[PDB]
Write a protein that binds this ligand. Structure first.
Ligand code: A1H4X
Ligand code: A1H4X
Ligand code: LYS
Ligand code: LYS
Lengths: 496, 495
C-alpha cells in the first residue's frame, strides 16, 4: 500500500523537479535478442568504446556493488542483458549519477545508452553512460509465480513465467499451421456473422442480445455451419472459417464461454474422406511440434503422472450404438426414438448410476449413455461414429445403417476435439428434423435450436454432396502444450 | 409457380421407384479446371473412347436438340464444360435415356460419366454415357442477377464479380497478417465478452451469462486487453477479428466488422504513420499495380474518380483546420464551458447538427466532421486531436491540450485510429473519470471506468504505439464498392 503511494509521490516529485517524466519516445539501437546475437560470443572483458548503443527493457535486478558502480539486469523479448553503470562513464548532462540512479526501482521500464561488450566474468553487458526512467512500476513485484492472480492479472504471469509465454507462441504456431493446411489445399478463408437473428449448428445454449435500431434480438453464434453450407450452395466448393464461437453455459477445465474453432465445408467429400483428412491434419501438427506421434501428457498437472498419447494413424473407430450395447450387455430398443427406448434408457441410467439429462429426450439419453460407455474408452485419438439421426439433425442418413447418420466425433482422453459429418442436403428431411429440434427446445432442451427457414430455402437451391467438420483448437492446444486446464491456453479466460 | 411443389413431387416419385435419390458420394475423376487443362487443346472432334471419366457440376444450360441428343453445360470451380448426351451411348442399366434425362433441370447439381474430347465445333466436351442427379434445384433460377444480400448463394452462383470480391478480401487479410508476422508480431486473441466494455467511442451490445450470473458486453475494441499484453512483455502483438456496435447501419457501418489492432512497444505515433503508409500503399500496389486506383463514390452508375495513395500522405492538424474553416479561433481551454458555448454557436452558424449531450469532445467531433474530414479525398491523416476527445492517447509532447493521435481518412471515411499510448496512470484514471461523467450526463458512446486496466498501467506500460484499421472499409476501396453490403458475405439487413 505504502510502496504504491510512495512511488506516486516520488513520480510527482520528479515531475515537479523538471526531471524526465514519462518520455514519449526512446529510440533503441536494436532489440535485446539482436544485441545478444551480435555480442553474445565476444571475449570476456571485451568492450567496444567506439560504438554507442541504446537499449531498453524491464529491470529485473538492481545491485549497487560500490559507491561507484551499479549493476542492473534488464529483460525484453525473452533476453536478459546486464547493465554496468560506472560513475566515471556517467553523462553529467543527464544529471548527477546518484540522482539519475536513485529514481530507478526493480520492475521499472528503463532505457540505457552505452558501449557494448562482456564483463570480465563473462556476462553479456552494456557499459552505460546514461539511464532514462520510461515507465515506473508502482508495485513490489513477486519474484516468481491465490493463484487466480495468474488469470485475473495475466500481465504478471507473462512478466514472470517463461512457460506461460511459450504457450501463447505455440498457440499462434498451431493456428498458422492450420490456416496453411487449408490454404494450400485451395480452401477459401471466409468470415460469417457472429450475430445471428436465428442461432443454429450446434448443441448449445446461446448468448442473447438486442439491436436497438434494427429492433430485433440477435444471438451470438454457436457455430458458423449454416452460413458455411450456403457458400457451398453458392459454388465456392471449399471454404473454411477459423474464429470464435460462444456458449452461454458453465465453465470447467475444458469449457470456456468463448473458444476458437475451425470449420470447413468441402464439396464432394463424405465422412470417410473427413476421417482421413482429420488424421492427416492432426498427426501432421503433432509431428511438427513434437517430432513424433507419441507425446507426453500430464492429466493431473505437472506434479502428477506422465502418460503417453499415441497419434499413430489410423485411429480406432467405435460405433456409437454397438459400443453402448456392449456396455449394457443388451440391445437398445428400436426405433431408438420410441417411447419404449426412452423408458429403457431411463431404466438403464438408474441401473448404471448415470445422471439423467433434462428433458429426457431420446437424443439426450443416448448422449449420456455414450458419455458413460463409449467416451470413457477414448484414451488415444478415437473416432466415435455413426450417431443416431435423432441426436444429429444436420447429418445425412447413413447409407447402410438404419436410423444412423454419417457422423463422427474425435475424442482424445475422453475430450471432444472434432465433430463432422456427410452433410444433410435433402430439404424435406432437414425441415422435419428442424421441427423436431424446435419441439425439443419448446419442451425445455436448452441445447436444441429453432427452425431456420433461410437455411431450408438455401437447401432448396441444391447443396452438392458435401462433407463438413469442426475442430476445437483450444482443446487441441491443451494436448499439444501439455496443459490440463483451459485457463492455461487462453490469455484472458473466464473466471467465476 | 407450382415449380417448387412439383419438384418435391418429382423427387418423391424417384425415391419411391428406387431410383437414385440424393447419392451420398460421387467420386470425380478430376476437377473441371483439371479437365480443361488436360483436354482443352485436343483437336476438334477428338474423342478418347478408351478413357471413361466422372465429372460433376451445376447445370447452367440444357438444350434437348432432338429426341436422341441433349446438350448440357455444367459449371464448377470457375470452369464450364459441355456434356453431349447421345442416346446411342447411354447405359441402359441406369434407366431408359428419356427417363434418366427427364429428371434433370437447369440448376441441378449432377454427375456424368463418359469419354473426353471436343465437339466438331471445337467445344471442350464430355460424351456422356450416364447422368446422376446429385442435388436438385427446386427453384427456377434467373439467368443472371436485395436478393443478392439476403440470398448470397444466388449471387455467388450467378455472379463471377461477387466471387472475385470475396477472394480479394481473403488476399487482403492474408497480406495483412503476413505484414505483421514478418515484423515479428505475435498474433493473439483477447475476449469478445467483456465484464466492462471500453476502448472506443461506441454503444455496445449487452448480454447475460446465466451460469455465472453476470451481465456481459460484446467488445467494441480489444485495446485495453492488448495493452495489458505489452505490460506483460510480449512487445509486439496484433489481433485481427470482429468488433461490435449496437448502432445504426449505413453504407459504411455494419453491427459487426473486422478490424486489426496492433500494439508495438517503443513506437510513437510518427512511427505508426510511417507503418500505415507502408502497409496500405504496399497492399494497394499488390492488388492494383499502381498507387492510383479507381473509385465509384455513388455506385457503378455514377462517376469514377481516382484515389492517389502516393506517399507522403497529407497531414491535417485537427484544431488548426477547424479554425481555418471557421475563420476564427476556438476558445481556450478547449474543454471550458466558454468554448463549449462557442462551439454550439459555431454549429448553429454553419448549420452543423448538434451532438447530444453537448460535451466539448462531441462538439469538436462535429466540427472536424464538417470542416476537416470533408477535405480528405486521397488518404489523409488528421492529427493531434484534443485530449478531451482522446482519453487513451498520450499528451502531445509539444502542443498544449492535444494528444499524439491520428485518424486516417479516405474519401471522408475513417480507416484508422492510432496514438502514442497513454502510459501514465494518474492521468489515465482522471480521463476515465471524465468518460464515466460523460456517460452519466447522457453520452451513450462514453465508456465506464475499468479499474483492472488502471491497475495494469500501475505495473508499467512501456512507451508504446497502438493502432487499428477497419479492414472492411479498406476492402471497399480496394474492390471499388460504395456499400459495405458488397464486401460482407452476410451483411445485416432490415427486417
Ligand atoms: C475451450 C472450449 N470451450 C467450449 N465451451 C467448447 C465447446 F462447447 C465445444 F462444443 C467444443 N467443441 C468442438 C468440437 C467441434 C467444434 C469445437 C469445444 F472445443 C469447446 N472448447
Ligand atoms: C464496416 C464497419 N462498421 C462499423 N460499424 C465500423 C465502426 F463502427 C468503426 F468504428 C470503424 N472504425 C475503424 C477505425 C479503427 C477501428 C476500425 C469501422 F471501420 C467500422 N467498419
Ligand atoms: N457445427 C459443429 C461442427 C461441424 C459439424 C459438421 N457440419 C459443432 O459445432 O459441433
Ligand atoms: N481502439 C481504437 C483503435 C486503436 C487506437 C489506438 N490505441 C478504435 O476502436 O478506434
Amino acid at each position: 500500500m505504502h510502496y504504491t503511494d510512495n512511488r506516486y509521490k516520488m513520480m510527482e516529485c520528479i515531475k515537479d523537479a523538471g526531471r524526465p517524466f514519462y518520455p514519449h519516445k526512446f529510440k533503441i539501437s536494436m532489440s535485446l535478442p539482436a544485441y545478444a546475437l551480435k555480442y553474445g560470443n565476444v571475449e570476456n572483458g571485451y568492450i567496444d568504446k567506439d560504438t554507442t548503443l541504446s537499449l531498453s527493457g524491464r529491470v529485473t535486478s538492481i545491485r549497487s556493488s560500490s559507491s561507484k558502480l551499479i549493476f542492473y539486469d534488464i529483460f525484453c523479448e525473452e533476453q536478459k542483458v546486464q547493465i554496468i553503470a560506472n560513475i566515471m562513464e556517467h553523462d553529467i548532462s543527464t544529471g548527477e549519477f546518484s540522482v539519475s540512479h536513485s529514481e530507478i526501482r526493480r520492475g521499472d521500464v528503463v532505457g540505457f545508452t552505452g558501449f557494448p561488450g562482456k564483463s570480465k566474468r563473462g556476462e553479456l553487458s552494456l557499459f552505460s553512460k546514461s539511464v532514462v526512467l520510461l515507465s515506473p512500476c508502482y508495485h513490489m513485484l513477486p519474484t516468481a509465480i491465490d493463484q487466480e492472480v495468474r488469470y485475473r492479472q495475466r500481465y504478471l504471469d507473462l512478466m514472470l513465467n517463461e512457460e506461460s509465454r511459450k504457450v501463447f507462441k505455440l498457440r499462434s504456431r498451431a493456428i498458422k499451421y492450420i490456416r496453411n493446411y487449408f490454404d494450400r489445399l485451395g480452401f477459401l478463408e471466409v468470415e460469417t456473422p457472429m450475430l445471428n437473428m436465428i442461432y443454429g449448428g450446434a448443441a448449445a445454449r446461446p448468448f442473447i442480445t438486442y439491436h436497438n435500431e434494427l429492433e430485433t434480438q440477435l444471438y451470438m453464434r454457436i457455430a458458423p455451419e449454416l452460413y458455411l453450407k450456403q457458400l457451398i450452395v453458392g459454388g465456392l466448393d471449399k471454404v473454411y472459417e477459423l474464429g470464435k464461437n460462444f456458449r452461454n453455459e458453465g465453465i470447467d477445465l475444458t469449457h470456456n464461454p468463448e473458444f476458437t474453432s475451425v470449420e470447413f465445408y468441402m464439396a464432394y467429400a463424405d465422412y470417410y474422406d473427413l476421417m482421413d483428412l482429420t488424421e492427416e491434419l492432426i498427426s501432421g501438427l503433432v509431428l511438427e511440434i513434437h517430432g513424433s506421434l507419441k507425446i507426453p501428457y500430464h492429466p493431473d498437472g505437472p506434479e502428477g503422472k506422465c502418460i503417453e498419447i499415441d497419434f499413430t494413424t489410423p485411429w480406432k473407430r467405435f460405433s456409437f450404438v454397438e459400443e453402448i450395447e456392449s456396455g449394457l450387455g443388451e440391445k437398445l430398443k428400436r426405433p431408438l426414438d420410441s417411447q419404449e427406448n426412452i423408458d429403457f434408457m431411463v431404466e438403464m441410467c438408474e441401473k448404471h448410476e448415470i445422471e439423467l439429462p433434462h428433458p429426457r429426450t431420446a437424443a439426450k439419453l443416448l448422449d449420456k449413455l455414450a458419455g458413460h460407455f463409449v467416451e470413457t474408452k477414448c484414451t488415444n485419438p478415437s473416432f466415435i461414429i455413426d450417431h443416431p439421426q435423432t441426436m444429429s439433425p444436420l447429418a445425412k442418413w447413413h447409407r447402410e445403417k438404419p436410423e444412423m447418420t454419417e457422423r463422427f466425433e474425435l475424442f482424445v482422453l475422453g475430450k471432444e476435439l472434432c465433430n463432422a459429418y456427410t452433410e444433410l442436403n435433402e430439404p424435406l428431411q432437414q425441415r422435419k428434423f428442424f421441427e423436431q429440434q424446435a419441439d425439443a427446445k419448446a419442451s425445455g432442451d436448452v441445447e436444441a435450436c429453432p427452425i431456420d427457414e433461410t437455411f431450408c430455402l438455401a437447401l432448396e437451391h441444391g447443396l452438392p454432396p458435401t462433407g463438413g467438420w469442426g475442430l476445437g483448437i483450444d482443446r487441441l492446444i491443451m494436448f499439444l502444450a501439455d496443459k490440463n486446464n483451459i485457463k492455461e491456453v487462453l490469455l484472458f479466460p473466464a473466471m467465476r
